[PDB]
Amino acid sequence: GPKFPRVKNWELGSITYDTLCAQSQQDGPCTPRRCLGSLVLPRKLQTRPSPGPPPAEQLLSQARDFINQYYSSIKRSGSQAHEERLQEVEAEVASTGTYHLRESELVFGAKQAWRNAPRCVGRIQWGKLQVFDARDCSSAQEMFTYICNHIKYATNRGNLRSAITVFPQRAPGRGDFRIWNSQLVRYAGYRQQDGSVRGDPANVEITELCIQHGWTPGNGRFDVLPLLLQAPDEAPELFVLPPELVLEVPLEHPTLEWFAALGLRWYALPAVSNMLLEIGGLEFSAAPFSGWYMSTEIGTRNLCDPHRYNILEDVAVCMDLDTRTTSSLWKDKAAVEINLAVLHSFQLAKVTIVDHHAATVSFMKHLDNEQKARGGCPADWAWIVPPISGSLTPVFHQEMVNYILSPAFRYQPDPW
Amino acid sequence: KFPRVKNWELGSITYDTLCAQSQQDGPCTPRRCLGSLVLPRKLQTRPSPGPPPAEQLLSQARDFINQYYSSIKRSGSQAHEERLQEVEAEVASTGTYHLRESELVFGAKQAWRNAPRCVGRIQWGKLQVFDARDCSSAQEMFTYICNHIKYATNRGNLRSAITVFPQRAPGRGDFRIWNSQLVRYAGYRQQDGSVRGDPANVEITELCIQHGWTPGNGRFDVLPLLLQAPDEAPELFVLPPELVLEVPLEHPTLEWFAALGLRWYALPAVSNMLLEIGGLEFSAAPFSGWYMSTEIGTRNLCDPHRYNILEDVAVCMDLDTRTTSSLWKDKAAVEINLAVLHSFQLAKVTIVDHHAATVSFMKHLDNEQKARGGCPADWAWIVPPISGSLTPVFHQEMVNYILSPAFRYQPDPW
Numbered sequence A: 001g002p003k004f005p006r007v008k009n010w011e012l013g014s015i016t017y018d019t020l021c022a023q024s025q026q027d028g029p030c031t032p033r034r035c036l037g038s039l040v041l042p043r044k045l046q047t048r049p050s051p052g053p054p055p056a057e058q059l060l061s062q063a064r065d066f067i068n069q070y071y072s073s074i075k076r077s078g079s080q081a082h083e084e085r086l087q088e089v090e091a092e093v094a095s096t097g098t099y100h101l102r103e104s105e106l107v108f109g110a111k112q113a114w115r116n117a118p119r120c121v122g123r124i125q126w127g128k129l130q131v132f133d134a135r136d137c138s139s140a141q142e143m144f145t146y147i148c149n150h151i152k153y154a155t156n157r158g159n160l161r162s163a164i165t166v167f168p169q170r171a172p173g174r175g176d177f178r179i180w181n182s183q184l185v186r187y188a189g190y191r192q193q194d195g196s197v198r199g200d201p202a203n204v205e206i207t208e209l210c211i212q213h214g215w216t217p218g219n220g221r222f223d224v225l226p227l228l229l230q231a232p233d234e235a236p237e238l239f240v241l242p243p244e245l246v247l248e249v250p251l252e253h254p255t256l257e258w259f260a261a262l263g264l265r266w267y268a269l270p271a272v273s274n275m276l277l278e279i280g281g282l283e284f285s286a287a288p289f290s291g292w293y294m295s296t297e298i299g300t301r302n303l304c305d306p307h308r309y310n311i312l313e314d315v316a317v318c319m320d321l322d323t324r325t326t327s328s329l330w331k332d333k334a335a336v337e338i339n340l341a342v343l344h345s346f347q348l349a350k351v352t353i354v355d356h357h358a359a360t361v362s363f364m365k366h367l368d369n370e371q372k373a374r375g376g377c378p379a380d381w382a383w384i385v386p387p388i389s390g391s392l393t394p395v396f397h398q399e400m401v402n403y404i405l406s407p408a409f410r411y412q413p414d415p416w
Numbered sequence B: 001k002f003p004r005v006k007n008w009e010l011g012s013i014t015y016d017t018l019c020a021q022s023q024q025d026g027p028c029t030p031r032r033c034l035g036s037l038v039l040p041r042k043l044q045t046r047p048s049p050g051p052p053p054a055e056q057l058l059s060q061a062r063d064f065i066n067q068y069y070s071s072i073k074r075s076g077s078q079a080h081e082e083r084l085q086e087v088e089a090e091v092a093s094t095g096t097y098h099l100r101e102s103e104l105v106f107g108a109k110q111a112w113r114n115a116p117r118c119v120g121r122i123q124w125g126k127l128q129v130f131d132a133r134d135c136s137s138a139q140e141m142f143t144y145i146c147n148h149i150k151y152a153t154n155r156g157n158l159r160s161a162i163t164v165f166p167q168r169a170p171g172r173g174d175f176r177i178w179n180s181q182l183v184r185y186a187g188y189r190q191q192d193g194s195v196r197g198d199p200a201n202v203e204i205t206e207l208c209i210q211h212g213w214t215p216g217n218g219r220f221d222v223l224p225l226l227l228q229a230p231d232e233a234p235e236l237f238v239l240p241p242e243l244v245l246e247v248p249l250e251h252p253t254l255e256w257f258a259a260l261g262l263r264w265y266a267l268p269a270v271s272n273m274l275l276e277i278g279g280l281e282f283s284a285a286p287f288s289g290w291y292m293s294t295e296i297g298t299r300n301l302c303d304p305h306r307y308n309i310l311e312d313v314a315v316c317m318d319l320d321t322r323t324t325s326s327l328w329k330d331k332a333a334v335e336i337n338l339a340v341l342h343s344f345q346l347a348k349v350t351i352v353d354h355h356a357a358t359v360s361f362m363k364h365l366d367n368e369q370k371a372r373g374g375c376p377a378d379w380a381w382i383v384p385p386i387s388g389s390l391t392p393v394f395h396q397e398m399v400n401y402i403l404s405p406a407f408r409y410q411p412d413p414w
């Protein structure tokens, strides 16, 4: 039959063919010899600093392609405006070596990038993104203003709205606009003498980096870190977020009265700030985006990973579970209650959140929409299936083809 | 050339050099990753009506033999040299060859070791290999299968085993076991599409009744075996009940659980896969070990397209099945898995939970890193269906690739 990957759903027995992957203009880590699809950071997309301006030839075909996607999207492919915009980009790359995006094009690409993200299970919301254009930004101080504006609009007092702020693209031989923090909001990770980490172990490097840059470190388990903002060709500057802007949710359990006493909490706004936004060849090194959490992110990964808060044992001890034998499923039991606590605490606080069941169901809906609209949907199985109750969600039984489409969000090396 | 493999829990890294030995292609390409797919679109095992290019067969053979002699520290020895020549000799003359019992035993063990989707590979060295190549009838396969089951079950103290029937022969039909497992519960489609029993076995059940099997009418009716000898119609054989050990399911504290009347069989014995060694193919080589609790408690009993007992348990647990955020599914899945573990332990039948199983697999990875410089593993299949990131394997990157000897899927005989 069809000469594209055959994708099957084992729960429903249905079949589909992905023809969209034929559009993938970039390779991944896989080869007929071995599958490296479980690797978190395979050296493939990696947007390593390529300082010396890019092959005018390469950037052109990448730009020619994006512009086609844009006119296609507004149903004007082949129009006079399309060709003119085409000649316009070529000319500008001819004389300056680079080019710029019109307002509407930036909005279109930001959305496509989210739309194209293989690891995002919340893409059914892709068409509803607020795009803040901050391409005029020219100082670390100004970056801080936009970021604060972003957090204010995105948080919206608990009724969270997806958003993205776009700072100046990379320029020939010039410094990049960079946000050193991985997320606009993160908790400190303090390296202790005995060797342990107080707070979040994932943020130890960035925590010390702030200290080295003048931040007076605290000593709590949930200290909100300051932002290290770097304008072109300048050392990063330090900025502390107005506490009132950072909305947090204390965690309590619906029926375990002692859980609230654990003093656990989490911030409501998940805002990735270290990824690179790539559109038509142009690279936006600073372009923080945010949506709203899926309960397992906080409840299972953040609070229970061995290398994070690792609270599983403490909660199980409080639940009086037999933690000396794997077969008592003490880990499974404590993980459930903790996730329940997170969901319950957000609903009480009236802060937007979605459980892993609702989330995956809507992603199945998104896959159907995309099958029709584009002939497929790039998806990373290991990342789409939740960290708990995997097979209990519909995505587990859905095969998925993973590949890279552009516009795209890519990982980039740390500025330091 | 050599992939870096990281464990995000410990920050450790390793380089997989074993994949260089991979001589078989997967479904992945630089353009897109199809690793989440269960069955190969082309990596099948096409017919054997005409011999296989001697060039090909011969090279796989020389490689396997070389493998076999390295394993017993007699590489380049005299015996080794004379074995290669025997194989060269037989192939040139008949277009095929035959393995010696000891090579077969070695090959079977390696096939399991190379099984990317198996989490219990730490046991790969402990496998009882029954040579059943001296089989000429379906009636004989049945006695062999019965002995395998008796031995493997060992009154609850399960022991891993494999039984190897005659290899495929060009132009001749295959010895086949139609059933996917030696023990499966019938799936009876009612009238209105619903199904009584295991929905996964509807087809095999229908084929049985179509060959003279008198169907039962329960949810856990042990199916008969449809054994087939070359170019013959499959024959029906019912398994002696005293031979099929089962475990009634009950819960530690929830007195009512037993009411549900749920049960499962002790022996997980796959029978529709193909064993390949030195280019030779064993179309009927049933193998077995013991269950990991999740296969039963999560997949077989909770999958939507399987027994799908999730809602019944939740209602009995008097949980709020009105909304998803109540995590009633997660809570009920946990108790059902606890019940399987409890029930199996009570009945003194071997079983391993997913926490213990994945811990042992991590050790296997390390053992294999030193022994071969890598270990082919399929992440999606190695990480359990529940409590994924709560186990060490979730946080471990993995490389998937095909090594031979190997167990492979093959077309359905009908």
Ligand code: HEM
Binding pocket: A110, A114, A117, A119, A120, A121, A122, A123, A125, A129, A162, A163, A164, A289, A290, A291, A292, A293, A294, A297, A354, A359, A383, A409
């Ligand atoms: C509206 C709610 C949204 C939900 C609930 C959602 C949920 C998720 C989840 C569960 C992941 C994986 C998290 C992890 O395992 O670390 C993810 C990844 C991702 N999401 Fe979404 N997402 C949403 C909004 C957004 C938005 C607004 C964008 C971009 C404009 C976006 C872009 C991405 C990207 C790029 C990744 C992968 C990041 C990485 O590689 O670490 N998401 N999302």
Ligand code: HEM
Binding pocket: B108, B112, B115, B117, B118, B119, B120, B121, B123, B127, B160, B161, B162, B287, B288, B289, B290, B291, B292, B295, B352, B357, B381, B407
């Ligand atoms: C000692 C106990 C064993 C345990 C606990 C174990 C556990 C598992 C599990 C959980 C899977 C995935 C099952 C699924 O999701 O359908 C698996 C797959 C597999 N195992 Fe094992 N295993 C054991 C013994 C064996 C033995 C003795 C062999 C062969 C000699 C073997 C060969 C395989 C193969 C080929 C697969 C993949 C089957 C497929 O593609 O569907 N395993 N094992």
Ligand SMILES: N=C(N)NCCCC[C@H](N)C(=O)O
Binding pocket: A270, A272, A290, A291, A292, A293, A294, A297, A298, A301, A302
């Ligand atoms: N819900 C969203 N938008 N998630 C984006 C992923 C990064 C958040 C991270 N997993 C965390 O738990 O903080």
Ligand SMILES: N=C(N)NCCCC[C@H](N)C(=O)O
Binding pocket: B181, B268, B269, B270, B288, B289, B290, B291, B292, B295, B296, B299, B300
């Ligand atoms: N534990 C073992 N040996 N598993 C092998 C796979 C076949 C069993 C299947 N998953 C089932 O649930 O029946």
Ligand SMILES: [Zn+2]
Binding pocket: A030, A034, A035, A036, A037, B028, B029, B032, B033, B034, B035
């Ligand atoms: Zn792959």
